[PDB]
Amino acid sequence: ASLLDSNFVPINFTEFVQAISNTYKQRRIQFYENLKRHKR
Amino acid sequence: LSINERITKELAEVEERERIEKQLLLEAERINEIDTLAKAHLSNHFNKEVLLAKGYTLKDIMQAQRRELVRKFVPIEQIKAIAKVSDISHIDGEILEQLVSLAKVNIKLRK
Amino acid sequence: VEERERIEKQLLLEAERINEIDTLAKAHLSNHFNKEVLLAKGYTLKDIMQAQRRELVRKFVPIEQIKAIAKVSDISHIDGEILEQLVSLAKVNIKLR
Amino acid sequence: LSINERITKELAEVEERERIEKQLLLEAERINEIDTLAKAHLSNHFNKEVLLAKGYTLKDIMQAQRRELVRKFVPIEQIKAIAKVSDISHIDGEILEQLVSLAKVNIKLRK
Amino acid sequence: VEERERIEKQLLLEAERINEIDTLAKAHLSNHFNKEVLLAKGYTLKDIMQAQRRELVRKFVPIEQIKAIAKVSDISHIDGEILEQLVSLAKVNIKLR
């Protein structure tokens, strides 16, 4: 249910918007997973 | 045996050894692919270690993992069409290679 | 004369296969690949049938199966038992479609 | 074998292949006509799919549809006159072709 | 043809041995000794495998066992059944490690 999946084929604009929101969330999750703050 | 005969024999020998080396690389890649597929898509009970402990040849382990992957991914209709039969117990070979290629396509599209 | 009888049996078999292929292709691909216009363009009957089969594969069978099962992306030269497997997969695809 | 013999053999071979191609087209048209007649004038139980499931040859299906169409459209007197007998169980052939032509005429005039 | 069948059996055996050696060596020694870069540098497959084995011995097997069991400090020329014993001892060492 995200734009990242190539197999994903949106059917209407509403599904397309939902995929965008899911895609934004996944990037935020991935960003925090990969984030490495400076402790000094 | 003249010089041309010497040269053609030398070149043929070199090419034969090169082809054998390429075959060895292909076998190594096949074993790596089987290992990755067994780790990623099949249960731990199908690991090469436990199968070898049960006393199966390496080729038996490979065709085993392939048949299990085909059943897991490839649908029964596709098996009955490409392999012409439902049972994969006696379909090891080039048809099995086509079936595992279809299984790779299936997992790629599944992701 | 039974040899010619069996030859006629095989003739009927391939004629039925051709008719089925044509009937499904007309409703699936286009009218541009109709037997009449292809014959006018100057293609033999077997060439017409194999071209229609390749187009059927190019419509139903996805490209990944072509480059894995048939080992080549281009169906232009794969004809044979591999083409039979491809058209069988296309039949399965249109059945599930 | 001189040049004229070469040319006559080449032309005869080409003409033979052309006649075979025309025969294949004729067979395709015959199958299409049988399909249309079976769909339009005969019950669903006579469909090629169910008949083939019952295990009948394609030619058997064709002559079957033809005999049924003759009984449905062509009157019994016309059958007894043209085919010289009432039963059509053993009249498959050119006489059957004449009977189905008469049946086509009958449906055309019926509409 | 069963002679070629058994030859293929031995081919599979040595291919599996090569794959196992490569998989453990990649995670233990370095990426500099990868098969691709070694082949680019111009070493045959058997030479690559024996060099990787000698490096495995030089990593796990301590030097005293090399100069006592293998009778020479330099593994550069000890190849053979002594090298098999050395790689077995290296396997034991990595197992206990």
Cβ-based interface (< 8 Å): residues of B facing C: 77-78, 81-82, 98, 101-102, 104-105, 108-109
| Structure token digits, residue C79 | 């004809």
- For residue D75, the SS3 value is coil
8 Å CB contact between E21 and B32: no
Burial of B17 (0-12, 13-18, 19+ CB in 10 A): exposed
Host H or E run for residue D53: helix D48-54
Half-sphere exposure of D41 (CA within 13 A, CB side): 23
Technique used by the depositors: cryo-EM
State the Cα–Cα distance between residues D83 and D10, nearest whole angstrom: 44
- Residue B38's region, left for phi above 0, alpha for psi from -120 to 50, else beta, is alpha
In the numeric block, the tokens 């009888």 are attached to C5
Task: For residue E22, give the chain B residue with the closest CA.
Answer: B28
| Structure token digits, residue B74 | 């490839």
Among E14, E83, E32, E94, which Cα is nearest to E59's?
E94
Nearest Cβ partner of D31 from C9, C16, C45?
C16
Half-sphere exposure of E56 (CA within 13 A, CB side): 27
Nearest Cβ partner of C69 from B102, B108, B109?
B102
State the Cα–Cα distance between residues E53 and E88, nearest whole angstrom: 10
Among E39, E25, E52, which Cα is nearest to B21's?
E39
State the Cα–Cα distance between residues E36 and E34, nearest whole angstrom: 6
Nearest Cβ partner of E19 from B21, B31, B59?
B31
Give partners of C (≥3 CB pairs < 8 A): B, D
A2-37 burial: b if 16+ Cβ within 10 Å, else e: eeeeeeeeeeeeeeeeebeebbeeeeeeeeeeeeee
Task: For residue A4, give the chain B residue with the closest CA.
Answer: B111
8 Å CB contact between C90 and C60: yes
Q: How far is CA E35 from the centre of its chain?
A: 13
Half-sphere exposure of D23 (CA within 13 A, CB side): 11
Q: Which chain E residues are Cβ-neighbours of B58 within 8 angstroms? A: 12-13, 16
State the Cα–Cα distance between residues C79 and D20, nearest whole angstrom: 23
**Three-state secondary structure of chain C:** CHHHHHHHHHHHHHHHHHHHHHHHHHHHCCCCCCHHHHHHHCCCHHHHHHHHHHHHHHHHCCHHHHHHCCCCCCHHHCCCHHHHHHHHHHHHHHHHC
Distance of residue C30 Cα from the nearest chain D Cα, in angstroms: 19
Task: For residue B76, give the chain C residue with the closest CA.
Answer: C92
A5/B109 Cβ within 8 A: no
Half-sphere exposure of B45 (CA within 13 A, CB side): 1
| Structure token digits, residue D103 | 């049946």
| Structure token digits, residue C12 | 């009927």
| Structure token digits, residue E35 | 């098969």
Host H or E run for residue D64: helix D58-73
State the Cα–Cα distance between residues C92 and C72, nearest whole angstrom: 20
| Structure token digits, residue E25 | 């060596």
E15/B28 Cβ within 8 A: yes
C69/B82 Cβ within 8 A: yes
Residues 6+ apart with CB under 8 A from C44: D21
Residues 6+ apart with CB under 8 A from C5: none
Nearest Cβ partner of B81 from C62, C64, C89?
C89
Distance of residue A39 Cα from the nearest chain B Cα, in angstroms: 36
Give partners of A (≥3 CB pairs < 8 A): B
State the Cα–Cα distance between residues B107 and B110, nearest whole angstrom: 5
- CA torsion D96-D97-D100-D104 (nearest 10°) is -170
- CA torsion D43-D45-D50-D52 (nearest 10°) is -70
Residues 6+ apart with CB under 8 A from C75: C54, C57, C58, C66, C83, C86
State the Cα–Cα distance between residues E4 and D70, nearest whole angstrom: 67
Distance of residue D58 Cα from the nearest chain C Cα, in angstroms: 8
Distance of residue B56 Cα from the nearest chain C Cα, in angstroms: 28
Q: Is the dihedral of CA A4, A5, A9, A14 positive or negative?
A: negative
Cβ atoms within 10 Å of D24's Cβ, excluding its own: 17
- For residue E60, the SS3 value is helix
| Structure token digits, residue D92 | 């498959």
Nearest Cβ partner of D24 from C9, C15, C23?
C15
Half-sphere exposure of D69 (CA within 13 A, CB side): 29
Nearest Cβ partner of C12 from D21, D35, D59?
D59
Distance of residue B103 Cα from the nearest chain A Cα, in angstroms: 16
8 Å CB contact between E37 and E5: no
| Structure token digits, residue B81 | 């069409």
8 Å CB contact between B96 and B67: yes
Residues 6+ apart with CB under 8 A from A22: A1, A2, A3
Strands (E) in B38-89, as ranges, are none
State the Cα–Cα distance between residues B100 and B94, nearest whole angstrom: 10
Burial of B111 (0-12, 13-18, 19+ CB in 10 A): exposed
**DSSP string spanning D86-101?**
S--TT--SHHHHHHHH
Q: What is the DSSP letter of D46?
A: G
- What is the residue type of D23? Q
Task: For residue C81, give the chain B residue with the closest CA.
Answer: B82
State the Cα–Cα distance between residues E88 and E82, nearest whole angstrom: 10
Give partners of D (≥3 CB pairs < 8 A): C
Q: Which chain D residues are Cβ-neighbours of C16 within 8 angstroms? A: 31, 58
- For residue D63, the SS3 value is helix
8 Å CB contact between B77 and C80: no
Nearest Cβ partner of E16 from B21, B23, B58?
B58
In the numeric block, the tokens 């000794």 are attached to E33
Alpha-carbon Rg for chain D, nearest whole angstrom, is 19
Distance of residue D98 Cα from the nearest chain C Cα, in angstroms: 21
Q: How far is CA C89 from the centre of its chain?
A: 12
Burial of B38 (0-12, 13-18, 19+ CB in 10 A): buried
Residue spans of alpha helices (H) in chain E? 2-28, 35-41, 45-60, 63-68, 81-96
Q: Which chain E residues are Cβ-neighbours of B32 within 8 angstroms? A: 19, 23
C88/B82 Cβ within 8 A: yes
